[PDB]
Design a protein around this nucleic acid. Structure first.
Lengths: 126, 52, 51, 139, 150, 108
RNA sequence: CGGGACCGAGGACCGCGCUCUGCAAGGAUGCUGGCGUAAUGGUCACCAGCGACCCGUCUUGAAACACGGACCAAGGAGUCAAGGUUUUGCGCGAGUGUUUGGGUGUAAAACCCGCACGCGUAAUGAAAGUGAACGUAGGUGAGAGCUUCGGCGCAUCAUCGAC
RNA sequence: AAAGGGAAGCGCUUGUGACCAGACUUGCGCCCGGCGGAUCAUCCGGUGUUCUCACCGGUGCACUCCGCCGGGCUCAGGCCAG
């Protein structure tokens, strides 16, 4: 069903924090690593350089872990898992785990329709 | 069941231990009349109104 | 007096007999001590390995 | 004595077999747990007096702990099946939750769970067909 | 920017025990409630000593308790947030009412044989919730081999 | 355990005489004070003596059977006559035993 | 008395008040329109304005010099043991330590057993040796807590005594 | 598919093109009319309980209860705006 009424969801930063020189070296993954060189410009925070993650970018406590519909994702593996969201259909949505078979997915989707629970990936394996 | 008492009475150097708490029911202890009769009146509620 | 416990027969029905509950069932329940002793005791059957 | 509901909560507040812990919240599989939330208020296996509601073939089925049979698990639950009007089910559940002082704080949660189960037992409506959108999906 | 020559200081005292004893957790909850809802400084001191560690809770002997029972303290309830130990150098134990965290078996037996009473801290909370007519005792803190070698 | 070490956290940031052929069995002589002397009596009989239910009997204590060789005089004794058998005794311990009404017997 | 910009945090009532049928008084509501889908939003590629030295190491005060780096995958560096020390948690407590060994076993597990022994319970002296109460285990000044409201006074500190 | 007048690569912010995740589809509560059934209220008996609250069996004879179907009404509902 529709989610419970909430404050507007604000992301302070949508862009990811890319690792320094990971755009120039393929052996460097783009996952963030804090530069530890004493002369590093990103670590010293010169302007025009990559930003570094800090707790000031944190999301609002009222809307943290909310998908844009306002629900919180709950990973489910079976019908007994999705029936745990009987009392939270306006707050939690169900997300079927990737290794669940198609027929069990049909069972979970049928139970979630009876319980009025949103399924995030209900069109999978059809 | 009959032999369990003899089993713990035959262990030399060991006795069944004394608990540091006599009554484990904290609700009974707190809401007993002996404690409640001497308490100060509450200075607030669970939720506080926003002043300004 | 000390509590009693029912004795059940081979059919699963009570036999009419009771036993006095042993005094160990009123011991303190200490999960931290249980965890410490279990951590120590679970390593005592280990076989050594080395290159 | 040496055992209380407070002590059972202190023992099993960090781990038990009913616990489902994830990033977005902690849930409980306990049958006597209304709202399926891990807390002392809702831990029915911990609390001395507790209620639980499950679906039946039609209607709800409510179990309640019996304080005098805590050491007898086969006869520790008082079970009533309500297969009748939803209003009568709510009245009876609220009566056994609040009238005699048997966890009056769980009255709203019990009525809510009964209402949720009875609404889930209704027939479902067919969903509208999906509308194709964009460039690749429509063509 | 603001010029702060002085520095705000985080607390240098315990707010919770490091022990995972569930009975100690229940006792801490009880005395938190008592120290919040009563004006007695006794409950605050007892809660803060329940927070403390074992080197900060030295044992108290029956000889020390009998020493402090003199001069009009014979009827006060002795409160020790520590282990009460026995002293076999003391041949005659007087009648006394002691509440403690734990007793050794010989000390408890000698108190009960002398005709006194042994209590836990929750029983102390039941009978003297404001700590009236109580004698609060501590053991020798500096009487330790490490403290001697300091 | 390895996982609790600080190394895991730091991952990414790195006179007188000489005695030839000394034998300690010559110099073995453990000592006990008189304020521990009544602890060698078994507890029930000790409590009977301290209460005063034995007004016609005096206890005899052998220190060598308990593993002590010398009686020292720290503390005080009750007014009960006690016979003490010891290899060595200090002057104050013997004085306090005599004041308590007993006798110190010398043994080998 | 106008003109403009940005913002609407909170979520039954409680309060301060006022111009007192009510209110601009402890935080935005009311009315209306178009659309209801890629329209808003997002990702990717590119152009545009502005911004922006190549990393690591070394050196000293710092730069510069110098050294390493053609690219990618996998491997790759404060570990273990013994002995101390401080702190935390636990058990017992003037005691404590079953596991050298013995008994037992569903058999390298678990359970049970005790003599000796180690440490502690007494120190000092090169040694021979001797070995800790004048006193409610002392006086004074503080000192949490308690108090019958006169005082009793934990830990600890300073000082004077006693052994 | 795109860019390129002696480096590219990167940050902030628009735009273009390509490709997408959501959200929405109506719910709740009333007033009528038409159906389909008596697990309406009370009382009686049994049973269980938290010992005053419930379930079961009889009793309702349709101005009472429970669903369904057509309308009408109010409210709450998505995005961008005045």
């Amino acid at each position: 069903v529709a989610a419970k009424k909430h404050v507007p969801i604000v992301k302070k930063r949508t862009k990811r924090f890319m690792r320094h020189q990971s755009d120039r070296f393929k052996c460097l993954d783009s996952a963030w690593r804090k530069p530890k060189g004493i002369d590093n410009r990103v670590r010293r925070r010169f302007k025009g350089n990559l930003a570094m993650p800090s707790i000031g970018y944190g999301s609002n406590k009222k809307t943290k872990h909310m998908m844009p519909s306002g629900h919180k994702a709950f990973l489910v593996h079976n019908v007994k898992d999705v029936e745990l969201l009987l009392m939270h259909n306006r707050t939690y949505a169900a997300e079927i785990a990737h290794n669940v078979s198609s027929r069990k997915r049909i069972d979970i989707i049928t139970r979630a329709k009876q319980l009025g629970v949103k399924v995030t990936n209900a069109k999978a394996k059809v | 069941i009959k032999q369990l008492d003899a089993v713990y009475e035959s262990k030399k150097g060991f006795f069944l231990p004394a608990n540091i708490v006599s009554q484990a029911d904290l609700s009974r202890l707190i809401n007993s009349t002996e404690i409640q009769s001497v308490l100060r009146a509450p200075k607030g509620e669970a939720r506080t109104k926003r002043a300004c | 007096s000390r509590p009693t416990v029912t004795v059940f027969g081979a059919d699963g029905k009570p036999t009419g007999a009771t036993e006095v509950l042993p005094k160990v069932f009123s011991a303190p329940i200490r999960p931290d001590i249980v965890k410490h002793v279990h951590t120590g005791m679970a390593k005592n059957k280990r076989q050594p390995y080395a290159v | 004595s040496n055992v209380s509901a407070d002590l059972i909560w202190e023992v099993s507040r960090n781990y038990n077999s009913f616990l489902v812990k994830q990033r977005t919240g902690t849930f409980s599989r306990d049958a006597l747990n209304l709202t399926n939330q891990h807390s002392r208020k809702h831990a029915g296996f911990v609390n001395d007096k507790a209620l639980g509601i499950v679906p039946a073939e039609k209607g709800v089925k409510v179990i309640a702990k019996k304080v005098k049979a805590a050491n007898k698990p086969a006869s520790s639950l008082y079970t009533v099946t309500y297969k009748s009007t939803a209003r009568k089910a709510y009245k009876a559940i609220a009566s056994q939750a609040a009238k005699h002082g048997y966890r009056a704080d769980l009255r709203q949660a019990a009525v809510a769970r009964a209402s949720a189960i009875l609404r889930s037992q209704r027939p479902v409506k067919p969903e509208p067909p999906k509308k194709l959108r964009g460039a690749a999906a429509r063509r | 920017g603001i010029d702060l020559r002085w520095k705000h200081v985080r607390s240098s005292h315990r707010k919770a025990p490091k022990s995972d004893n569930v009975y100690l957790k229940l006792l801490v909850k009880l005395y938190r409630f008592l120290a919040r809802r009563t004006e007695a400084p006794f409950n605050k001191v007892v809660l803060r000593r329940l927070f403390m560690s074992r080197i900060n809770r030295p044992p108290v002997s029956l000889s020390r308790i009998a020493r402090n029972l003199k001069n009009g303290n014979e009827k006060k309830t002795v409160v020790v947030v520590a282990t009460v130990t026995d002293d076999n150098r003391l041949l005659q134990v007087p009648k006394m009412e002691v509440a403690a965290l734990r007793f050794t078996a010989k000390a408890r037996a000698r108190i009960e044989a002398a005709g006194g009473r042994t209590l836990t801290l929750d029983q102390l909370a039941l009978e003297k919730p404001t700590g009236a007519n109580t004698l609060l005792l501590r053991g020798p803190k500096n009487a330790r081999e490490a403290v001697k070698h300091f | 355990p390895t996982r609790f070490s600080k190394t895991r956290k730091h991952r990414g940031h790195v006179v007188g005489m000489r005695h030839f052929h000394l034998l300690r069995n010559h110099y073995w002589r453990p000592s006990i004070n008189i304020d521990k002397l009544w602890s060698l009596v078994p507890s029930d009989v000790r409590e009977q003596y301290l209460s005063g239910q034995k007004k016609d009997t005096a206890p005899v204590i052998d220190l060598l059977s308990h593993g002590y060789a010398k009686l020292l005089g720290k503390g005080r004794l009750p007014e009960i006559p006690v016979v003490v058998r010891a290899r060595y005794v200090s002057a104050e311990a013997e004085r306090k035993v005599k004041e308590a009404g007993g006798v110190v017997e010398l043994v080998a």
